[PDB]
UniProtKB/Swiss-Prot annotation, chain A:
The modification Tele-methylhistidine is found at residue 69. It is found in: Cytoplasm, Cytoskeleton. Polymerization of globular actin (G-actin) leads to a structural filament (F-actin) in the form of a two-stranded helix. Each actin can bind to 4 others. Belongs to the actin family. Actins are highly conserved proteins that are involved in various types of cell motility and are ubiquitously expressed in all eukaryotic cells. This is Actin, alpha cardiac muscle 1. Transmembrane segments: none annotated. It comes from Mus musculus (Mouse). Oxidation of Met-40 and Met-43 by MICALs (MICAL1, MICAL2 or MICAL3) to form methionine sulfoxide promotes actin filament depolymerization. MICAL1 and MICAL2 produce the (R)-S-oxide form. The (R)-S-oxide form is reverted by MSRB1 and MSRB2, which promotes actin repolymerization. In vertebrates 3 main groups of actin isoforms, alpha, beta and gamma have been identified. The alpha actins are found in muscle tissues and are a major constituent of the contractile apparatus. The beta and gamma actins coexist in most cell types as components of the cytoskeleton and as mediators of internal cell motility. The modification N6-methyllysine is found at residue 80. The modification Methionine (R)-sulfoxide is found at residues 40, 43. The chain holds residues 7 to 189 of 377 of the full protein.
UniProtKB/Swiss-Prot annotation, chain B:
It catalyses: ATP + H2O = ADP + phosphate + H(+). One of its GO terms (molecular function) is myosin binding. It holds the Pfam family Actin. Belongs to the actin family. In vertebrates 3 main groups of actin isoforms, alpha, beta and gamma have been identified. The alpha actins are found in muscle tissues and are a major constituent of the contractile apparatus. The beta and gamma actins coexist in most cell types as components of the cytoskeleton and as mediators of internal cell motility. One of its GO terms (biological process) is actin-myosin filament sliding. Keywords: Acetylation, ATP-binding, Cytoplasm, Cytoskeleton, Hydrolase, Methylation, Muscle protein, Nucleotide-binding, Oxidation. This is Actin, alpha cardiac muscle 1. Polymerization of globular actin (G-actin) leads to a structural filament (F-actin) in the form of a two-stranded helix. Each actin can bind to 4 others. Oxidation of Met-40 and Met-43 by MICALs (MICAL1, MICAL2 or MICAL3) to form methionine sulfoxide promotes actin filament depolymerization. MICAL1 and MICAL2 produce the (R)-S-oxide form. The (R)-S-oxide form is reverted by MSRB1 and MSRB2, which promotes actin repolymerization. Monomethylation at Lys-80 (K86me1) regulates actin-myosin interaction and actomyosin-dependent processes. Demethylation by ALKBH4 is required for maintaining actomyosin dynamics supporting normal cleavage furrow ingression during cytokinesis and cell migration. PANTHER family: ACTIN. It is an enzyme of class 3 (hydrolase). Its EC number is 3.6.4.-.
Swiss-Prot record, chains C, D:
The sequences of cardiac and skeletal muscles are identical. Belongs to the tropomyosin family. Homodimer. Heterodimer of an alpha (TPM1, TPM3 or TPM4) and a beta (TPM2) chain. Interacts with HRG (via the HRR domain); the interaction contributes to the antiangiogenic properties of the histidine/proline-rich region (HRR) of HRG. Interacts (via N-terminus) with LMOD2 (via N-terminus) and TMOD1 (via N-terminus). The chain holds residues 64 to 114 of 284 of the full protein. Binds to actin filaments in muscle and non-muscle cells. Plays a central role, in association with the troponin complex, in the calcium dependent regulation of vertebrate striated muscle contraction. Smooth muscle contraction is regulated by interaction with caldesmon. In non-muscle cells is implicated in stabilizing cytoskeleton actin filaments. This is Tropomyosin alpha-1 chain. It is found in: Cytoplasm, Cytoskeleton. It comes from Mus musculus. The molecule is in a coiled coil structure that is formed by 2 polypeptide chains. The sequence exhibits a prominent seven-residues periodicity.
Amino acid sequence: TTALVCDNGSGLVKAGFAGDDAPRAVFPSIVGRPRHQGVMVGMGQKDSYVGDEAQSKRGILTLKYPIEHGIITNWDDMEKIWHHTFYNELRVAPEEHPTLLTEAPLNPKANREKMTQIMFETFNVPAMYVAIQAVLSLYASGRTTGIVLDSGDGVTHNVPIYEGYALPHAIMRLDLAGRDLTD
Amino acid sequence: TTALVCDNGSGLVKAGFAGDDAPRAVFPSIVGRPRHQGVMVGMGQKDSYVGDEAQSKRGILTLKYPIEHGIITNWDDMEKIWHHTFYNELRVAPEEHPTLLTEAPLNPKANREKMTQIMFETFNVPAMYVAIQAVLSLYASGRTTGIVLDSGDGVTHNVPIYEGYALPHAIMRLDLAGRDLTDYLMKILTERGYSFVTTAEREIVRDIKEKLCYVALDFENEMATAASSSSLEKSYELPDGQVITIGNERFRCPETLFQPSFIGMESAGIHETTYNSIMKCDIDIRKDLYANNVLSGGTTMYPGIADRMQKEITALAPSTMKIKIIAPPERKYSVWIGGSILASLSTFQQMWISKQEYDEAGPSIVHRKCF
Amino acid sequence: LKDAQEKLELAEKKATDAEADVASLNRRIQLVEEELDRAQERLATALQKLE
Amino acid sequence: LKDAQEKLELAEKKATDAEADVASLNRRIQLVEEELDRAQERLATALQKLE
Ligand SMILES: Nc1ncnc2c1ncn2[C@@H]1O[C@H](COP(=O)(O)OP(=O)(O)O)[C@@H](O)[C@H]1O
Ligand SMILES: Nc1ncnc2c1ncn2[C@@H]1O[C@H](COP(=O)(O)OP(=O)(O)O)[C@@H](O)[C@H]1O
Ligand SMILES: [Mg+2]
Ligand SMILES: [Mg+2]
């Protein structure tokens, strides 16, 4: 079967089946509970709008990103985001598809372990693999050497690679990124 | 069984069974004791004529409304009005029917608690629920967003709603309404010689206001035109003859809505309190509120108001937004139609304040979860 | 009276007919205005795309 | 009745005025239908130019 190449990121979740050119569904990763009271009855008001739906009703929501700086600070919201990504934006049950998450360098271990535990227990995938976000960006350029500066929205990290041999002592991770520029 | 959708209002009580198009019985809410002595014996003279009966014997009565500005100031008279409404205009005993009253926003708590206590103790209804008069008017339009300006006869209030989530911090309640316009018209008619003083003649001035007055599109041009030509002077026949001619009093009476400085009120008109109510809302739902401005209530029936208000708001608002004013022809009964729709819903059937709940928590149950 | 009776009945029927006509036409004008506005929003989308 | 006679006459006149507005609303409906069709066409051409 085909593999699911998910990419959590921080600010935009990008996902799609392996072997294509562009991600199938790209949508902000925000989960916003309503904050006002609500008087219309039977309007079908949900308790949390996630993804791109909460960028249209954002006038009466309190959007809050579940990923602060690479690390994940709110596991329930992240689980909700993943569930939405699998079931509504791709409509493929995870029981029949391998997954390939991505993770920033130098992140806490507990984050990665919890990520794999969720993927194996809740969604019950067949097999998942976690890859460093810079090696992939080096794949896409068709190179095999080079030093890649991957300035995302959460964290900016700079992984040098030569001839396929990564240099673990030369990774410089800096926490300034797009969110701090927005602020 | 069926629910009773009563709507106390202030000036006209509108009631009827849930699920219809129009209220079954609409009659003024006035209770007038006789004031003269009375010499015929055995004529069967009662001590208080209520409802539409006192609009026919008003020549020898002293009519007095039991609801001043939304709030209820005379509880015995209001109880009498309710008793009349249930037993003579609908002829259905309240022991077998839920009731759905309506209440203006930002009203005193004691009024609402006393209302529920009366409905549960005196009339002994099975279950009653109190709803804000603007949400119903939004129901009737079939929308789910929009900012509704419900200019009744007692009080004008402006409740903005988005996606079903009401914004409690943006409700702008103003106490200028139809009654103050009647008093101001009665006060400016004296400039031609016609003096109306008695509380019975207030009804005649109200009829003049309803049948003749209109809202000018541009005030200064109309004031200049009425002062040169005579194409505006419309005449009207009093209940006894002696026709009267109304000149530029026609568009000066309802102009008070847009310039409350005429009756000495400080606040801004209904054209600017809507814009202020919008600007208090969040920055991302202002376009939808601009496009779905809803009018309701009786006093918004003046010929030519849906254009004056749109012109004013377009002047105030940013030039890019589209300003649209929804003015359905069934404006007067909009609140009651919305009340019927709400009472007819299946999802709403478990929100009533059941009597056993009131017995356990007292009248203060209304402020609790069952709002 | 009979003359008044017929006058009253005919005027009432005419009034109800006019009311129904104007109400349904109001619904129609609402619908067509919705058509116009929603089409305008499509126009804005297209303008942004082309630019 | 004389007053009922005047009332029925006034109500039938009101019916006729509602019919005049029925005509005006018909004109609005027709012109807005032209607008709807023109918008369909213009949106089609805009999307084509986008392609
Ligand atoms: N065209 C653009 N110009 C400038 N900044 C952009 C542009 N597109 C995205 N950004 C910034 O980049 C962020 C998205 O980064 P992204 O690569 O999606 O992060 P992640 O690595 O979490 O996927 C946004 O928050 C935005 O601030
Ligand atoms: N056709 C009309 N033209 C102008 N004013 C009207 C008209 N009908 C009613 N009004 C005014 O509106 C008032 C009735 O308002 P209403 O909506 O019944 O108040 P409530 O909200 O208490 O029911 C009357 O006192 C009258 O002054
Ligand atoms: Mg990234
Ligand atoms: Mg009202």
